[PDB]
Every structure is written in structure tokens, then in C-alpha cells.
Amino acid sequence: VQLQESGPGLVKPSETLSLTCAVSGGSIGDDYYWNWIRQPPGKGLEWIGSIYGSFGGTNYNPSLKSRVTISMDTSKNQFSLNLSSVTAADTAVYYCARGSYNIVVLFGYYFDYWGQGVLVTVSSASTKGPSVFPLAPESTAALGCLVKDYFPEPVTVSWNSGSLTSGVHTFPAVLQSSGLYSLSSVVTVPSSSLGTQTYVCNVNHKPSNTKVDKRVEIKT
Amino acid sequence: ALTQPPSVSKSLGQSVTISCSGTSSDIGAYNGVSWYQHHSGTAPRLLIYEVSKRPSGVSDRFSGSKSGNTASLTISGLQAEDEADYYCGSYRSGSTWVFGGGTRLTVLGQPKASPTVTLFPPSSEELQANKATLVCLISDFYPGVVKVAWKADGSAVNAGVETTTPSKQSNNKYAASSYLSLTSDQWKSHKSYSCQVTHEGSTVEKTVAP
């Protein structure tokens, strides 16, 4: 039983935020509550609303009720969120979550399974793809990649298509006064391996379709 | 809403209780208060449900109770792991669901750790675009406070510096990074640049050069 949010990571102020949750390992039509929950970075959790799988009834957070629509699709096994006329207050990590229960009238319900969450940024700023620069490289050596000047979050970085995980450290991004982000990812490797083993950082910034595998070599 | 202490500070090994004050329309209307743990980078984690039940996977150290309209989470034998935000929540008659405001739990007494510093010069291809970004990566330190100083030929550099707020690594130490954004002309105009990280009165410095 798994849930997965998807949708645009960037929405302009006053527009409508739309998200979908794909549910696996169980029928959405079963006797569960299906929920949308959000958390602005650095702030608290907030229940948005629910749709009841068996009968399709919705309940919404009263402070959001006028702007919120929750739907479900029995085929596809999905339910979704529409949040209209957004502002920067709506910038948040959005989660879908299953609400299970025993009896409800005696016990209410609780959220046992959650999606991984999707960040949605509400901003009028333009999407901007990063530049990806190698950070070129004793018994041990640090090498890396600079992912420079992008918007919005997030960027993902893996190494050698996910086969190199040991010694990898991807750093949280800096937000510069420009309004653009930069992050770096570093891997420490044996120096004897250099010139033999190839190291490639796999960078993805989906909002800008910037998908780069950058080879990192010692400077010559 | 449901009211929690914003902050609680305790020491390793000790026990802590976090309260959650609601109404007779939620906490006092059902045996349906639940508790969630949240670390940055992961979905909230269910700790307690139906006031005091633990799902499989949640340790013995977590327990829940309620009295009237106030629910309580107790965590025993506090470890570095337990540093997180904790939320209570409840169904509310007869139709909605409400989270507590959250409680930031700090666990003190963790071992001091000095930072490791890695400094990279600009790449060749960035320079070809007439820019130069120096990257100072700072890792494995505790507590999570550092001061960064950049120098060019031993002179202080104030312009072009951006430095992140420290964030926890998986190993419960902190990481941070500092970026010095220059032009290529600037980079080539000096003999060297240094990143100096000061942590609890001790300093670690790295230098790069064109």
C-alpha cells in the first residue's frame, strides 16, 4: 500500500494549484478516508480535506473550504486536489495520506500511510535551469558537482546512475539574493581509482527539463 | 486549534512529555488523538493512534495518554534521533480533522564534533563564462552553529558570500555550505582564496589558488 503525489512544482499567484495522488496496493473505493495534508517549510502540518472512498463524500478544512476541491477517480486509482486563487501562503510540501479507523464515532481516524510529499512553490518568478559544473579533485579524494542558479526547488543528484552511494554527500541548497538556488554534491573516492573509474553526477531539474549527466575528471 | 508547547528542551537519557490541548469536540469527544513525528526530508511518521496505541515499528519509548481535553505524548530515554517536530491531531465532530501547532524537541548533551572543510575552486567551463564560484562544504559538526570567513590573499571578502543555515545529516551531525560568487577576472586577480570555518572557538581553514 503506497501513495504518490504528482503535479507542477511551481504555480503563479492567483492561479489554481492542482495535484494528484496515485494509490497502489489497494482500492481507493475501499472504506478509507483519502486525505490531503500540507506543511509550509518551517511551519506546522495542516489538514486540507478528505474524500471518503466508499461513497465519495468530501469534508474540507473550514478555513480553506471555499478554495478547495477534492475529487477521486476509481479507475486509475487516484484522488486529487484543486486549490484555487493561491498565494505565497500556499507554498508548501503537499502530502496525500490514507485515513484508517476502527469505528470513527468512538475513535475518529488517523493517518497511517503517507506519500513522500511534493513541494509546490507559489511565485511569479520564472523557471530557470541550472548550470552543472564539475568540481574536480592523498589516499582519498573529494570530487563533486555544482548545480548553479536554478528555480524552483528541487534538484535531484545521484552518482554513476545510482550505483555509487557510499561516500556521497548532497548538500541542501543555498538561496542567493538573486532568488536563485545552488547546491553541490560531493563523493569521496579512493585516489587510486581516479583515472580508472569514471565518476558522473546525474542531475535533474524537472521544472526546466535540465537533465545532465556530468563527468567529473581531474583538471589537466 | 490544538495547543502544544512550541519548544521543549531536554538532555540525553531523560524523559519528556509534550501536551496537546484541544476541545470537548475533538480530544474529549473521541478516543481518537494521534501523534506524528516529523524530520525534515521525510513524510510525517505516525507514532501513536487511538490515544495510546503504537503501530508496529514504533519503539517502546513512545507512549500516549489523555485527560479531559488535553492529550500527552511521553518519550523516554531521549536519543539524538528524537530531535524532531511532534504533532498531535484529532478528528473533530462531526466531519473535520485538526493538527496541533507542533512542538520542536531539542535534545542537549550530544557530543561536540569539529567540522571537516572541503573547498573547491571554479571549474574551467564556468570560467569560460567569465564567472567563478568557490564552494566551501562544511560537514560533521555539532552543535549546528558555524561562522564562515572568506579571504583573498589574506584580506577579508564580504561581497559575494552566501552561506546556508546548518541542517542535520543522517548521522545527526550538521552540514552547511558557503558560496563565494566572483567574476573570472576577480578569481585570476588573486594569488589565493581561503575559506575559514569557526566552530565553538576553533578554526579550520582551506585555501585554493588559480
Residue numbers in the entry:
A (entry chain H): 2 to 35, 35A, 36 to 52, 52A, 53 to 82, 82A, 82B, 82C, ...
B (entry chain L): 3 to 6, 8 to 27, 27A, 27B, 27C, 28 to 95, 95A, 96 to 106, ...
The authors write:
We report here the immunogenicity in rhesus macaques and CH103 CD4-binding site bnAb UCA KI mice of sequential Env immunogens derived from the CH505 HIV-1-infected individual who made the CH103 bnAb lineage. In macaques, vaccine-induced nAbs  had epitopes overlapping that of CH103, bound only open trimers, and neutralized rare tier 2 viruses.
DH522 lineage antibodies, DH522.1 and DH522.2, were isolated from blood memory B cells after four and six immunizations, respectively. For comparison, we found that the DH522 lineage antibodies bound natively glycosylated and glycan-deleted CH505 TF gp120 Envs equally well, but did not neutralize HIV-1 pseudoviruses bearing these Envs nor bound free N-glycans.
